Design a protein around this ligand. Structure first.
Ligand code: SAH
Length: 387
């Protein structure tokens, strides 16, 4: 019965086979999400984001009257935006153009309407009373976006707003226990367990997670892994995250902890090449400079038939721009031919770039008719290392 463990993990199910067999599970898992309610919450968060932007710009002395025109550079110097925050500032201006306050003409901006009096803290509280299940999202958005002017002026390190040493759980709850993240993280767990269901007893499985953070996605996977034949490598670029995850996950003795910067050759950071069966990357790969070189490093870690499980957001979101868009990773991208002005890719763009970086049999999840629009704005992508 035993066959050499040195040979590639051919027992791994194809991603397409995995999605076919998970189809009845995914159909019922999607229905657990309120379609009408998740949409109206998301819509209101996008409107509240406009009020945070206007409040911050007025705090920096925005005095642009209607008809007046300005370019990005002049407005940044006027408001005092530091050079490292201009790309975020440009996106904020783009948001104001989407709602009709501004208009984009060539590389110029024209003020169409005078922004009215806003009080986003008061409206955030009203939404908190109506949707207490979104308290983590509202509280994080209030803590981050209410210091938008200080971040734009380089006076406040936005990592101390998103990921302060004393509160890493708030941002974790967004990645872990939000309505949409509950579904996506469950898909991540079901995919991984289904792909390895034919694991021979005489063989161990090696999983590596990139950008695992505090372990929001990780917590869904660990309880289902067989500790006797699993090695799970928990990695993040930052040791503060692996340190916090090591405390949370003490019960699991098959976990290893190590730092990994996916933008640099992993084999120079103490990782074996082509020796991991499953790589998990939840909400991280977008925060890199070049997706092709990031995906080539990801592919470099996968065994010849290994599985890449990707969890990414696929659409622009105003309130996300006021939280994780404050951080440097949101604006690292320079592959402008692929990503002209935003770090995220949609389903079709991910499939194309994966097929160009050595991945095959690419599946995007979930794909159910009658699906809530919120589930269309994020995806779990499963792809196989090709050769
Ligand atoms: N270049 C890089 N290589 C590896 N990890 C990176 C990275 N740039 C940012 N990261 C990490 O990616 C993480 C994104 S937080 C993503 C959510 C996380 N998977 C969870 O569920 O909790 C951050 O913790 C950050 O430290």
């Amino acid at each position: 019965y035993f066959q050499s463990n040195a040979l590639p993990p051919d027992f791994l199910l194809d991603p397409v086979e995995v999605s076919q067999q998970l189809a009845p599970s995914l159909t019922e898992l999607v229905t657990l999400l309120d379609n009408a309610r998740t949409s109206e919450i998301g819509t209101q968060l996008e409107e509240l984001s406009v009020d945070y932007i206007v409040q911050g710009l007025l705090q920096m002395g925005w005095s642009y009257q209607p008809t007046e025109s300005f370019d990005l550079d002049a407005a940044a110097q006027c408001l005092g935006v530091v050079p490292t925050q201009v790309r975020l500032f440009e996106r904020l201006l783009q948001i104001l153009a989407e709602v009709g306050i501004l208009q984009s003409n060539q590389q110029q901006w024209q003020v169409q309407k005078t922004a009215q009096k806003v009080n986003p803290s008061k409206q955030s509280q009203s939404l908190l009373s109506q949707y207490p299940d979104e308290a983590a999202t509202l509280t994080l958005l209030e803590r981050c976006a209410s210091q938008l002017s200080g971040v734009l002026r380089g006076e406040i390190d936005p990592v101390q707003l998103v990921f302060p040493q004393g509160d890493l759980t708030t941002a974790t709850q967004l990645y872990k226990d939000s309505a949409v993240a509950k579904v996506m993280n469950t898909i991540v767990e079901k995919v991984i367990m289904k792909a390895m269901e034919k694991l021979p007893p005489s063989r161990g499985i090696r999983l590596l997670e990139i950008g695992a953070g505090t372990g929001g996605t990780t917590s869904y996977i660990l309880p289902h892994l067989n500790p006797n034949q699993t090695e799970y490598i928990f990695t993040d670029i930052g040791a503060l995250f692996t340190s916090k995850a090591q405390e949370k996950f003490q019960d699991y003795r098959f976990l290893g902890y190590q730092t990994l910067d996916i933008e640099v050759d992993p084999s120079s950071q103490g990782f074996e090449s082509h020796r991991y069966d499953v790589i998990i990357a939840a909400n991280v790969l977008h925060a890199t400079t070049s997706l092709k070189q990031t995906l080539s490093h990801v592919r470099q870690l996968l065994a010849p038939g290994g599985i890449l499980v990707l969890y990414e957001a696929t659409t622009r979101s105003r309130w996300v721009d006021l939280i994780f868009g404050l951080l440097e990773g949101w604006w690292k991208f320079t592959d402008y031919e692929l990503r002209p002005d935003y770090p995220l890719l949609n389903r079709e763009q991910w499939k194309k770039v994966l097929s160009e970086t050595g991945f095959t049999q690419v599946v995007t999840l979930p794909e159910v008719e009658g699906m809530a629009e919120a589930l269309s704005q994020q995806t779990v992508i499963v792809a196989q290392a090709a050769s």
